[PDB]
C-alpha cells in the first residue's frame, strides 16, 4: 500500500527517490537470453554492461528504474535481481504482455490472462518469488481483439491489486485514446495508468486531453533520435528523426499547460536488444553514450535552463513516480 | 556414425531399440512452462503424467523417443531429462525452429540461425550441457522467406554435425517438395531428411516420389485421425476425418513399393499442450487413450494382420530410426 515490489523485495515509497519509469535491462524474447546468451556476447558480459550503466545512472542521481520488460520481451527477473543488487539501484519488475505474445499466450482468454498477471503480482515471477510492481501492455494504433483482452486483463489485475498499468502506444496514431476507452469500460481509474511513448508525437491537444482526464503521460523516449543516421534505414525507423530537444520541449509544454503532476519521464533505454536488427545496440550507444543517465545529465539541466523550477523537476522525477507506483485501490 | 546424444548423455546405436521418431513431452512456447506452470496444473503434475505415459509406451516395447519440440515449442530439456530418468526411456532432444518463432529469432540471418542450431547440437541447450540429436523445422504453404532461412540453417548445421533434419509439412499441399528443393540446393543428402506429417494425405505418388529420391517419410500422425468430432470447432484442423487404419495402410503401400527402409512411424503425441485452445489435451486423450502407445499397441498389430512380417516391422521401428539418428556425412 505504502510499499512497492522490487526485485530485491518490498521497499517504502520514500526509498524510491529519483525514478525512471520506463526502462529495460534487456529487450529480448521469452526464453531467448537463456537459450542463446552468446547473442549478447555472454550473460556475464550483459550483466556487467547493465551494472556499469546502472551505476553511472546512480552516480547521476537515479535511485529506481522500472523495467517494463514483459514475459514476451524476454524479461529475466533473475538477471534484474543480479544487476540491481550489484548496482544497488532499485528495479521494479513488470507483468503484462507486449507486442510479441507466443501462441501459448495469444490463445488465452481474458480470464486466463487475468490469472497470469495476478500470479506474477501476487505470487511471484516463475519460481523466483519476485513480484511484479507494474503491468505493462502494448497495442498497435487500432487495438486488435487479442490486445483488447490483454488491456481488460490488465485493468482487472490492477483493480484487484492496486498496481498500475503502463502502455506502449503509437502516439502518431493517438493510440492512448483507444486504450483509455477500454480501461475506463472496466472501471479502472486513469490515475492508475501511464500512456507511454507519448513523446513520439507533437500533438499537444492529444496529450493535454489525456492529462486532463487524470492519465499519466509517459514522455519516455527522449534520447531516441537517428539525426545524423538518415543513411541507416533500420535505425531511422526505430529512433525517428525528431531531436531529443524536440521531445524534451513536450515536458515543458505540459508543465506550461498546468499538468506537471501527470508527467513521467524516462529514456526507454536498454543494455541488450535482440528483438530488433543485429548490432542495433552499437548504433544506439553511439547516439546516446549517456544511456539511462541521459535524463538527469542532459534533460534536467535543459529544462532548468528553460526556466522550469527545481521543485517542479523534483516533483516530476520523484513525486509523480511515487504516486504512480504506490499500490492504490 | 556411432553415438546418439540423449538428454541423459550419449548412447550407442544398439541401445536405442524401438524408437518413436516424432513425439513431444509438452507442446508449448518458449519460457511458458516456467512462467506459468499452473496452466498444466503444476510442473510436478505434468512431469508425473509424462512419466506414466512413457512407462506405458515402454511396457509396449518403446525404448527411445525423439522429442521434436524446438525452442519455440517451449522445449524444456531439464523436464525431458527428469522424465527420461524416471521412465527409463531414452529421449533425444531437438534444435531448430517450428512455426512460432519470436522476434529475436524472426529477425536473424541464415548465418545467425546456423550458429544457434550449432550451439544446441555442439555445445548444449541453455546451460544444461544437453546436446540436441536432431534438427526440427517447419513450413507452411510454399515456404515463407523466413522459413527458407530456417531450412537452409538447418541444412548447414546438419552438414557440419551429421545430425539429421526432420520436418513439419502440410502434406495436403505437397509441402515436402519445396522443402526437398531447398535442402538439395544446400547439398544436403536426402538420407539425412525426414519429411514429416506425411500420413495426412492420400496422395501416394507424392510420398513414393520422395522416398524414391531417398527421403525418409514420416508417417507420424496416425492416431490424430479422430472420427466423431465434427461438432468441435477445433478438432478437425488438429485432428482428422479419416480413420487411423486408412493412414496405417500408407505404411503397407510404401513397403509394397519397396521403400520399407524409407519409413519412420510415430504418434506425434504429447502430455501437455498450451499452444492451442484450452482443454485440448482432454479432447486428445479421450480420442486416443493409448497416447504414445498407439503405434506399438494398435498400428503394429494391424500391419501384422495385413501380412507385414516381423522382420519388416522391426526394420521400420528399430533399424530405420537408428540409421537416421546416427550422425553421418557419408550419404
Ligand atoms: C521494447 As520498446 C522499443 O517497445 O520500448
Ligand atoms: C507441435 As505439432 C501439432 O506441429 O506436431
Ligand atoms: Zn514500447
Ligand atoms: Zn520500452
Ligand atoms: Zn508438426
Ligand atoms: Zn509434432
- What would the DSSP string read from start to end of A73-103? GT--HHHHHHHHHHHT-EEE-EEEE-S---H
Residue A301 CB: number of other CB atoms within 10 A?
11
Write out the E strands in chain B: 3-6, 9-12, 19-23, 26-27, 64-67, 90-92, 94-97, 134-138, 165-168, 193-195, 216-219, 263-265, 272-273
Measure the CA–CA gap between A245 and A266, rounded to whole angstroms. Answer: 14
Measure the CA–CA gap between B202 and B215, rounded to whole angstroms. Answer: 18
Set of cell numbers at residue B247: 493412414
Set of cell numbers at residue B298: 494398435
E strand or H helix at A53? helix A43-59
Nearest CB neighbour to A104, from listed B74, B116, B125: B74
Measure the CA–CA gap between A2 and A12, rounded to whole angstroms. Answer: 6
Query: Does residue A27's CB lie within 6 angstroms of at least one atom of ligand 1?
Result: yes
A285 touches chain B (CB under 8 A): no
Domain span at residue A126 reads: 1-329
- Residue A253 makes CB contacts below 8 A (sequence gap 6+) with A204, A207
Asked if the Cβ–Cβ distance from A35 to B30 is below 8 Å, we say yes
Torsion angles phi and psi, residue B96, rounded to 5: 110, -170
Question: What is the distance, to the nearest Å, from the Cα of residue B190 to the centroid of all Cα atoms in its chain?
Answer: 17
Q: Is B90 labelled a binding residue?
A: no
Distance from the alpha carbon of residue B23 to the mean position of ligand 2, in angstroms:
9
- Residue B289 makes CB contacts below 8 A (sequence gap 6+) with none
- In chain B, the number of structural domains is 1
Q: Is B231 labelled a binding residue?
A: no
Q: Is residue B151 within 8 Å of residue B182, measured between CB atoms?
A: yes
Nearest to B105 by CA among A284, A7, A29, A24: A29
Distance from the alpha carbon of residue B102 to the mean position of ligand 1, in angstroms:
15
Nearest to A224 by CA among A204, A243, A248: A243
CATH number, residue A133: 3.20.20.140
Torsion angles phi and psi, residue A206, rounded to 5: -60, -50
- Which atom of ligand 2 is the closest one to the Cα of B197? 5
A329 touches chain B (CB under 8 A): no
Torsion angles phi and psi, residue A137, rounded to 5: -135, 165
A278 touches chain B (CB under 8 A): yes
Strands A134-138 and A165-168 turn out to be parallel
Torsion angles phi and psi, residue B240, rounded to 5: -130, 175
Q: Is A197 labelled a binding residue?
A: yes
Set of cell numbers at residue A132: 511484479
3-state helix, strand, coil in chain B (%, to 5): 50, 15, 35
A276 touches chain B (CB under 8 A): yes
- Residue B7 makes CB contacts below 8 A (sequence gap 6+) with B77, B80, B81, B84, B91, B92, B93, B130
Residue B218 CB: number of other CB atoms within 10 A?
28
Distance from the alpha carbon of residue A117 to the mean position of ligand 5, in angstroms:
30
User: How far B112 CA lies from chain A's nearest CA (Å)?
Assistant: 9
| Residues β-bridged to residue B97 | B137
Asked if the Cβ–Cβ distance from A102 to B277 is below 8 Å, we say no
Residue of chain A whose alpha carbon sits nearest to that of B31: A31
Write out the E strands in A115-250: 134-138, 165-168, 193-195, 216-219
Torsion angles phi and psi, residue B166, rounded to 5: -130, 145
Q: Is A224 labelled a binding residue?
A: no
What count of residues does chain A have? 329
Measure the CA–CA gap between A132 and B35, rounded to whole angstroms. Answer: 13
- Which atom of ligand 1 is the closest one to the Cα of A68? 5
Set of cell numbers at residue A242: 525528431
Nearest to B234 by CA among B202, B282, B269, B200: B282
Q: Is residue B275 within 8 Å of residue B263, measured between CB atoms?
A: no
Residue B44 CB: number of other CB atoms within 10 A?
11
Q: Is residue B91 within 8 Å of residue B57, measured between CB atoms?
A: no
Nearest CB neighbour to A119, from listed B36, B102, B105: B36
Q: Is residue B201 within 8 Å of residue B247, measured between CB atoms?
A: no
| Cα atoms in the Cβ-side hemisphere of radius 13 Å centred on B307 | 5
Residue of chain A whose alpha carbon sits nearest to that of B32: A104
- Which atom of ligand 1 is the closest one to the Cα of A220? 5
Distance from the alpha carbon of residue A68 to the mean position of ligand 1, in angstroms:
9
Set of cell numbers at residue B97: 525452429
Residue of chain B whose alpha carbon sits nearest to that of A120: B35
How many Cβ pairs closer than 8 A exist between chain A and B?
98
- Which atom of ligand 1 is the closest one to the Cα of A221? 5
Resolution to 1 decimal, in Å? 1.9
Rounded to 10 degrees, the C-alpha dihedral A276/A277/A278/A281 comes to -60
User: How far B35 CA lies from chain A's nearest CA (Å)?
Assistant: 4
Q: What technique determined this structure?
A: X-ray
E strand or H helix at A19? strand A19-23
Nearest CB neighbour to B71, from listed A35, A108, A112: A35
Asked if the Cβ–Cβ distance from B276 to A126 is below 8 Å, we say no
Residues of chain A with Cβ-Cβ distance to B30 below 8 Å are 29-32, 35, 102
Residues of chain B with Cβ-Cβ distance to A138 below 8 Å are none
Asked if the Cβ–Cβ distance from A102 to B30 is below 8 Å, we say yes
| Residues β-bridged to residue B95 | B135
Best probe of the B interface among A27, A29, A79, by most B CBs < 10 A, is A29
Torsion over CA: B251, B257, B258, B262 (sign)? negative
**Tell me, what DSSP letter sits at residue B296?**
I
A129 touches chain B (CB under 8 A): no
Nearest to B42 by CA among B72, B79, B2: B79
3-state helix, strand, coil in chain A (%, to 5): 50, 15, 35
Distance from the alpha carbon of residue B268 to the mean position of ligand 3, in angstroms:
38
| Cα atoms in the Cβ-side hemisphere of radius 13 Å centred on A196 | 24
Q: Which B-chain residues 42-71 have CB contacts (< 8 A) with chain A?
A: 71
Q: Is residue A319 within 8 Å of residue A264, measured between CB atoms?
A: no
Set of cell numbers at residue A174: 493517438
User: How far A99 CA lies from chain B's nearest CA (Å)?
Assistant: 10
Query: Does residue A49's CB lie within 6 angstroms of at least one atom of ligand 1?
Result: no
Set of cell numbers at residue B60: 509396449
Residue of chain A whose alpha carbon sits nearest to that of B37: A126
Amino acid at each position: 500500500g505504502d510499499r512497492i515490489n522490487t526485485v530485491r523485495g518490498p521497499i517504502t515509497i520514500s526509498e524510491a527517490g529519483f525514478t525512471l519509469t520506463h526502462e529495460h535491462i534487456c529487450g529480448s524474447s521469452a526464453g531467448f537470453l537463456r537459450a542463446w546468451p552468446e547473442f549478447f556476447g555472454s550473460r556475464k558480459a550483459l550483466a556487467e554492461k547493465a551494472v556499469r550503466g546502472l551505476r553511472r545512472a546512480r552516480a547521476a542521481g537515479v535511485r529506481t528504474i522500472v523495467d517494463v520488460s514483459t514475459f514476451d520481451l524476454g524479461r529475466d527477473v533473475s538477471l534484474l535481481a543480479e544487476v540491481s543488487r550489484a548496482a544497488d539501484v532499485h528495479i521494479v519488475a513488470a507483468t503484462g504482455l507486449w507486442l510479441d505474445p507466443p501462441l501459448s499466450m495469444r490463445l488465452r482468454s481474458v480470464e486466463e490472462l487475468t490469472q497470469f498477471f495476478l500470479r506474477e503480482i501476487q505470487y511471484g515471477i516463475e519460481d523466483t518469488g519476485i513480484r511484479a510492481g507494474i503491468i505493462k501492455v502494448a497495442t498497435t494504433g487500432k487495438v486488435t481483439p487479442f490486445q483488447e483482452l490483454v488491456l481488460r486483463a490488465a485493468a482487472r489485475a490492477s483493480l484487484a491489486t492496486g498496481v498500475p498499468v503502463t502502455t506502449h502506444t503509437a502516439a502518431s496514431q493517438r493510440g492512448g485514446e483507444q486504450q483509455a476507452a477500454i480501461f475506463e469500460s472496466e472501471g479502472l481509474s486513469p490515475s492508475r495508468v501511464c500512456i507511454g511513448h507519448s513523446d513520439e508525437t507533437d500533438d499537444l491537444s492529444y496529450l493535454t486531453a489525456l492529462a486532463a482526464r487524470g492519465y499519466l503521460i509517459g514522455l519516455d523516449r527522449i534520447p531516441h533520435s537517428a539525426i545524423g543516421l538518415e543513411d541507416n534505414a533500420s535505425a531511422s525507423a526505430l529512433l525517428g528523426i525528431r531531436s531529443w530537444q524536440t521531445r524534451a520541449l513536450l515536458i515543458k509544454a505540459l508543465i506550461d499547460q498546468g499538468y506537471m503532476k501527470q508527467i513521467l519521464v524516462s529514456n526507454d533505454w536498454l543494455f541488450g536488444f535482440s528483438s530488433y536488427v543485429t548490432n542495433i545496440m552499437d548504433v544506439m550507444d553511439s547516439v546516446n553514450p549517456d544511456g539511462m543517465a541521459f535524463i538527469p545529465l542532459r534533460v534536467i539541466p535543459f529544462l532548468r535552463e528553460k526556466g522550469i523550477p527545481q521543485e517542479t523537476l523534483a516533483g516530476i522525477t520523484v513525486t509523480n513516480p511515487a504516486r504512480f507506483l504506490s499500490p492504490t485501490l
